[PDB]
Amino acid sequence: IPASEQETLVRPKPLLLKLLKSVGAQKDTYTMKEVLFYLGQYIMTKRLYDEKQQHIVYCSNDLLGDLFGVPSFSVKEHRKIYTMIYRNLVVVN
Ligand SMILES: CC(C)(C)CN1C[C@@H](N)[C@H](c2cccc(Cl)c2)[C@]12C(=O)Nc1cc(Cl)ccc12
């Protein structure tokens, strides 16, 4: 994953915007850095992740599961996480 991906400007779709607004998000255009931070905050706030769980996020009965279309995912699979996030936004250029 190149460093530049973090600077990508994005407009989240309604479901993702709903999720972001729960952890402070105020805006309609974000950087991918912001989106990844607010998602991370959402995950740790809802205890969907822990280091004793083999690096897995459990989102089966949660908004995040509906957004991503999976009951769970590994935090090590970075490219797959970007793909899941991209289905819920539109890039700005
Ligand atoms: C899981 C937790 C430790 C709470 C947060 N992790 C730690 C980072 N290594 C990871 C991450 C950072 C940047 C890009 C990616 Cl692809 C993944 C990240 C994160 O910072 N945001 C975010 C969002 C989602 Cl949906 C999944 C995983 C993450």
Short mmCIF file of N, CA and C and ligand atoms in Angstrom, two decimals:
data_model
loop_
_atom_site.label_atom_id
_atom_site.label_comp_id
_atom_site.label_asym_id
_atom_site.label_seq_id
_atom_site.Cartn_x
_atom_site.Cartn_y
_atom_site.Cartn_z
N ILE A 1 0.87 -1.21 0.00
CA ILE A 1 0.00 0.00 0.00
C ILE A 1 0.89 1.25 0.00
N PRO A 2 0.79 2.10 -1.04
CA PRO A 2 1.61 3.31 -1.05
C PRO A 2 1.08 4.36 -0.08
N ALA A 3 1.98 5.18 0.46
CA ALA A 3 1.66 6.25 1.42
C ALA A 3 0.64 7.24 0.88
N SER A 4 0.71 7.50 -0.43
CA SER A 4 -0.18 8.45 -1.10
C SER A 4 -1.67 8.12 -0.99
N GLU A 5 -2.00 6.84 -0.86
CA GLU A 5 -3.41 6.43 -0.69
C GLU A 5 -4.09 7.19 0.46
N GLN A 6 -3.36 7.41 1.56
CA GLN A 6 -3.88 8.17 2.71
C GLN A 6 -4.38 9.58 2.38
N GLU A 7 -3.81 10.21 1.36
CA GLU A 7 -4.18 11.59 0.98
C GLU A 7 -5.37 11.66 0.02
N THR A 8 -5.85 10.50 -0.44
CA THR A 8 -6.99 10.41 -1.35
C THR A 8 -8.21 11.09 -0.75
N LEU A 9 -8.83 12.00 -1.51
CA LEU A 9 -10.01 12.73 -1.07
C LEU A 9 -11.27 11.98 -1.48
N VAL A 10 -12.21 11.84 -0.54
CA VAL A 10 -13.37 10.98 -0.74
C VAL A 10 -14.66 11.60 -0.21
N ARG A 11 -15.77 11.25 -0.86
CA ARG A 11 -17.12 11.63 -0.42
C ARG A 11 -17.86 10.36 -0.03
N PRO A 12 -18.01 10.10 1.29
CA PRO A 12 -18.69 8.87 1.68
C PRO A 12 -20.16 8.82 1.26
N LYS A 13 -20.65 7.61 0.97
CA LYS A 13 -22.07 7.38 0.71
C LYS A 13 -22.83 7.44 2.04
N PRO A 14 -24.18 7.53 2.00
CA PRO A 14 -24.99 7.73 3.22
C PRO A 14 -24.76 6.77 4.40
N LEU A 15 -24.62 5.47 4.12
CA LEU A 15 -24.40 4.47 5.18
C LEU A 15 -23.07 4.70 5.89
N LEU A 16 -22.00 4.88 5.11
CA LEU A 16 -20.68 5.19 5.66
C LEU A 16 -20.67 6.55 6.37
N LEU A 17 -21.35 7.54 5.80
CA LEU A 17 -21.42 8.87 6.44
C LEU A 17 -22.10 8.76 7.81
N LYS A 18 -23.15 7.94 7.89
CA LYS A 18 -23.86 7.66 9.15
C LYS A 18 -22.89 7.11 10.21
N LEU A 19 -22.08 6.13 9.82
CA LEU A 19 -21.06 5.53 10.70
C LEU A 19 -20.04 6.58 11.17
N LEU A 20 -19.53 7.38 10.23
CA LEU A 20 -18.51 8.40 10.56
C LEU A 20 -19.06 9.47 11.52
N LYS A 21 -20.31 9.89 11.31
CA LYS A 21 -20.93 10.92 12.16
C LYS A 21 -21.14 10.46 13.62
N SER A 22 -21.11 9.15 13.87
CA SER A 22 -21.21 8.59 15.23
C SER A 22 -19.93 8.73 16.08
N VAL A 23 -18.78 8.87 15.42
CA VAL A 23 -17.49 9.01 16.12
C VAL A 23 -16.89 10.41 15.93
N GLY A 24 -17.77 11.40 15.73
CA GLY A 24 -17.36 12.80 15.65
C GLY A 24 -17.42 13.48 14.30
N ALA A 25 -17.48 12.70 13.23
CA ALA A 25 -17.27 13.24 11.89
C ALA A 25 -18.33 14.29 11.55
N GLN A 26 -17.87 15.38 10.97
CA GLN A 26 -18.68 16.58 10.76
C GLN A 26 -18.90 16.92 9.29
N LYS A 27 -18.20 16.21 8.40
CA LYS A 27 -17.94 16.69 7.05
C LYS A 27 -18.57 15.81 5.98
N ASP A 28 -18.55 16.33 4.76
CA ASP A 28 -19.00 15.57 3.59
C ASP A 28 -17.85 15.12 2.70
N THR A 29 -16.70 15.80 2.76
CA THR A 29 -15.48 15.34 2.08
C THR A 29 -14.40 15.09 3.13
N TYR A 30 -13.76 13.93 3.05
CA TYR A 30 -12.68 13.53 3.94
C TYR A 30 -11.43 13.12 3.17
N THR A 31 -10.30 13.04 3.88
CA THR A 31 -9.13 12.31 3.40
C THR A 31 -9.32 10.84 3.78
N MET A 32 -8.66 9.93 3.07
CA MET A 32 -8.70 8.50 3.45
C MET A 32 -8.08 8.26 4.84
N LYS A 33 -7.05 9.05 5.18
CA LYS A 33 -6.52 9.05 6.54
C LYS A 33 -7.62 9.29 7.58
N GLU A 34 -8.45 10.31 7.36
CA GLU A 34 -9.58 10.61 8.28
C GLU A 34 -10.58 9.44 8.34
N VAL A 35 -10.99 8.95 7.18
CA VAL A 35 -11.90 7.81 7.09
C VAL A 35 -11.36 6.57 7.84
N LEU A 36 -10.09 6.25 7.64
CA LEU A 36 -9.46 5.12 8.33
C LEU A 36 -9.35 5.35 9.84
N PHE A 37 -9.02 6.57 10.25
CA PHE A 37 -9.01 6.90 11.67
C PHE A 37 -10.37 6.78 12.35
N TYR A 38 -11.41 7.35 11.72
CA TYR A 38 -12.74 7.32 12.30
C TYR A 38 -13.32 5.90 12.31
N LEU A 39 -13.05 5.11 11.26
CA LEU A 39 -13.41 3.67 11.28
C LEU A 39 -12.72 2.91 12.42
N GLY A 40 -11.42 3.14 12.58
CA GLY A 40 -10.64 2.56 13.69
C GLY A 40 -11.20 2.92 15.06
N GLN A 41 -11.56 4.19 15.23
CA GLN A 41 -12.23 4.67 16.45
C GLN A 41 -13.57 3.99 16.69
N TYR A 42 -14.36 3.83 15.62
CA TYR A 42 -15.66 3.14 15.67
C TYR A 42 -15.48 1.68 16.12
N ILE A 43 -14.55 0.97 15.48
CA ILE A 43 -14.17 -0.40 15.88
C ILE A 43 -13.73 -0.56 17.35
N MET A 44 -12.79 0.27 17.81
CA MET A 44 -12.30 0.17 19.21
C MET A 44 -13.34 0.63 20.22
N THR A 45 -14.18 1.58 19.83
CA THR A 45 -15.28 2.06 20.69
C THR A 45 -16.32 0.97 20.94
N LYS A 46 -16.64 0.21 19.90
CA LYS A 46 -17.63 -0.87 19.97
C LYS A 46 -17.03 -2.24 20.34
N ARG A 47 -15.74 -2.27 20.70
CA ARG A 47 -15.01 -3.51 21.01
C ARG A 47 -15.27 -4.63 19.99
N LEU A 48 -15.20 -4.27 18.71
CA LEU A 48 -15.27 -5.22 17.61
C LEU A 48 -13.92 -5.90 17.36
N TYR A 49 -12.86 -5.40 17.99
CA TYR A 49 -11.49 -5.90 17.84
C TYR A 49 -10.80 -6.08 19.20
N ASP A 50 -9.90 -7.06 19.27
CA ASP A 50 -9.00 -7.25 20.41
C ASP A 50 -7.81 -8.11 19.95
N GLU A 51 -6.66 -7.94 20.61
CA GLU A 51 -5.41 -8.63 20.24
C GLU A 51 -5.37 -10.13 20.61
N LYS A 52 -6.31 -10.59 21.44
CA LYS A 52 -6.47 -12.02 21.74
C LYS A 52 -7.35 -12.79 20.72
N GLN A 53 -7.89 -12.09 19.71
CA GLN A 53 -8.84 -12.67 18.75
C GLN A 53 -8.24 -13.02 17.37
N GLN A 54 -6.92 -13.25 17.31
CA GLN A 54 -6.20 -13.54 16.05
C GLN A 54 -6.31 -12.43 14.98
N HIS A 55 -6.33 -11.18 15.44
CA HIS A 55 -6.34 -9.98 14.58
C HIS A 55 -7.62 -9.82 13.74
N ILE A 56 -8.76 -10.20 14.32
CA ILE A 56 -10.05 -10.23 13.60
C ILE A 56 -10.99 -9.15 14.13
N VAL A 57 -11.66 -8.45 13.21
CA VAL A 57 -12.77 -7.55 13.54
C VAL A 57 -14.10 -8.30 13.33
N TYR A 58 -14.93 -8.34 14.37
CA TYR A 58 -16.23 -9.03 14.32
C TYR A 58 -17.34 -8.00 14.18
N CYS A 59 -17.98 -7.98 13.00
CA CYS A 59 -19.00 -6.97 12.68
C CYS A 59 -20.36 -7.55 12.22
N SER A 60 -20.68 -8.77 12.64
CA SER A 60 -21.88 -9.50 12.17
C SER A 60 -23.23 -8.87 12.54
N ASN A 61 -23.32 -8.25 13.72
CA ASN A 61 -24.55 -7.61 14.18
C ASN A 61 -24.32 -6.12 14.36
N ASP A 62 -23.81 -5.50 13.29
CA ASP A 62 -23.38 -4.12 13.35
C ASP A 62 -23.46 -3.47 11.98
N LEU A 63 -23.69 -2.16 12.00
CA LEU A 63 -23.65 -1.29 10.82
C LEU A 63 -22.44 -1.60 9.91
N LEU A 64 -21.26 -1.73 10.52
CA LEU A 64 -20.01 -2.00 9.78
C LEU A 64 -20.08 -3.28 8.94
N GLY A 65 -20.74 -4.32 9.47
CA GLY A 65 -21.00 -5.55 8.71
C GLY A 65 -21.86 -5.34 7.48
N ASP A 66 -22.88 -4.49 7.62
CA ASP A 66 -23.77 -4.14 6.50
C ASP A 66 -23.02 -3.34 5.42
N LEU A 67 -22.20 -2.39 5.86
CA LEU A 67 -21.31 -1.59 4.97
C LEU A 67 -20.33 -2.46 4.17
N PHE A 68 -19.66 -3.37 4.88
CA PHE A 68 -18.58 -4.19 4.30
C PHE A 68 -19.06 -5.49 3.62
N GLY A 69 -20.26 -5.94 3.96
CA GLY A 69 -20.82 -7.18 3.40
C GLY A 69 -20.11 -8.44 3.87
N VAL A 70 -19.53 -8.40 5.08
CA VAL A 70 -18.88 -9.55 5.70
C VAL A 70 -19.24 -9.59 7.19
N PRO A 71 -19.30 -10.79 7.78
CA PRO A 71 -19.54 -10.91 9.22
C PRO A 71 -18.29 -10.62 10.07
N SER A 72 -17.12 -10.67 9.43
CA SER A 72 -15.84 -10.42 10.08
C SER A 72 -14.74 -10.26 9.04
N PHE A 73 -13.62 -9.67 9.45
CA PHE A 73 -12.44 -9.59 8.59
C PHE A 73 -11.17 -9.46 9.40
N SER A 74 -10.04 -9.83 8.79
CA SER A 74 -8.73 -9.69 9.42
C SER A 74 -8.20 -8.29 9.18
N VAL A 75 -7.67 -7.65 10.23
CA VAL A 75 -7.03 -6.32 10.11
C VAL A 75 -5.71 -6.32 9.32
N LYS A 76 -5.13 -7.50 9.10
CA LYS A 76 -3.88 -7.65 8.33
C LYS A 76 -4.09 -7.56 6.81
N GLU A 77 -5.33 -7.79 6.36
CA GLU A 77 -5.68 -7.78 4.93
C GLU A 77 -6.01 -6.35 4.48
N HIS A 78 -4.96 -5.54 4.34
CA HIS A 78 -5.09 -4.10 4.05
C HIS A 78 -5.78 -3.78 2.72
N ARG A 79 -5.38 -4.48 1.66
CA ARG A 79 -5.96 -4.25 0.32
C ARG A 79 -7.46 -4.58 0.30
N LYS A 80 -7.85 -5.65 0.99
CA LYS A 80 -9.26 -6.04 1.11
C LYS A 80 -10.07 -5.00 1.90
N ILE A 81 -9.46 -4.39 2.91
CA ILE A 81 -10.12 -3.33 3.69
C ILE A 81 -10.38 -2.10 2.81
N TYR A 82 -9.40 -1.70 2.01
CA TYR A 82 -9.58 -0.57 1.10
C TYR A 82 -10.69 -0.84 0.11
N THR A 83 -10.76 -2.07 -0.40
CA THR A 83 -11.80 -2.44 -1.37
C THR A 83 -13.19 -2.32 -0.74
N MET A 84 -13.32 -2.78 0.50
CA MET A 84 -14.59 -2.70 1.22
C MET A 84 -15.00 -1.26 1.51
N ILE A 85 -14.04 -0.42 1.89
CA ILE A 85 -14.28 1.02 2.12
C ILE A 85 -14.68 1.73 0.81
N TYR A 86 -14.00 1.40 -0.29
CA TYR A 86 -14.27 2.06 -1.59
C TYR A 86 -15.68 1.84 -2.15
N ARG A 87 -16.28 0.70 -1.85
CA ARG A 87 -17.68 0.44 -2.22
C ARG A 87 -18.69 1.39 -1.55
N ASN A 88 -18.27 2.05 -0.47
CA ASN A 88 -19.09 2.97 0.30
C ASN A 88 -18.71 4.46 0.14
N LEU A 89 -17.97 4.81 -0.91
CA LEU A 89 -17.57 6.21 -1.16
C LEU A 89 -17.34 6.52 -2.63
N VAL A 90 -17.15 7.80 -2.91
CA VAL A 90 -16.80 8.31 -4.24
C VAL A 90 -15.57 9.20 -4.12
N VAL A 91 -14.58 8.96 -4.97
CA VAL A 91 -13.32 9.71 -4.94
C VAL A 91 -13.51 11.14 -5.47
N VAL A 92 -12.78 12.09 -4.88
CA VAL A 92 -12.80 13.52 -5.26
C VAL A 92 -11.50 13.89 -5.98
N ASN A 93 -11.62 14.45 -7.18
CA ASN A 93 -10.47 15.00 -7.92
C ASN A 93 -10.88 16.18 -8.78
C1 LIG B 1 -8.23 -2.41 13.80
C2 LIG B 1 -7.61 -1.27 14.61
C3 LIG B 1 -6.34 -1.74 15.33
C4 LIG B 1 -8.62 -0.85 15.67
C5 LIG B 1 -7.33 -0.06 13.70
N1 LIG B 1 -6.45 -0.44 12.57
C6 LIG B 1 -4.98 -0.26 12.83
C7 LIG B 1 -4.33 0.01 11.47
N2 LIG B 1 -3.19 -0.89 11.26
C8 LIG B 1 -5.49 -0.30 10.47
C9 LIG B 1 -5.30 0.32 9.09
C10 LIG B 1 -4.72 1.57 8.85
C11 LIG B 1 -4.59 2.04 7.54
C12 LIG B 1 -5.04 1.27 6.47
C13 LIG B 1 -5.62 0.03 6.71
CL1 LIG B 1 -6.17 -0.95 5.41
C14 LIG B 1 -5.74 -0.44 8.01
C15 LIG B 1 -6.73 0.18 11.24
C16 LIG B 1 -6.92 1.68 11.28
O1 LIG B 1 -6.16 2.52 11.70
N3 LIG B 1 -8.12 1.94 10.74
C17 LIG B 1 -8.79 0.79 10.34
C18 LIG B 1 -10.05 0.66 9.74
C19 LIG B 1 -10.54 -0.59 9.41
CL2 LIG B 1 -12.11 -0.71 8.67
C20 LIG B 1 -9.76 -1.71 9.68
C21 LIG B 1 -8.50 -1.58 10.28
C22 LIG B 1 -8.01 -0.33 10.60
#
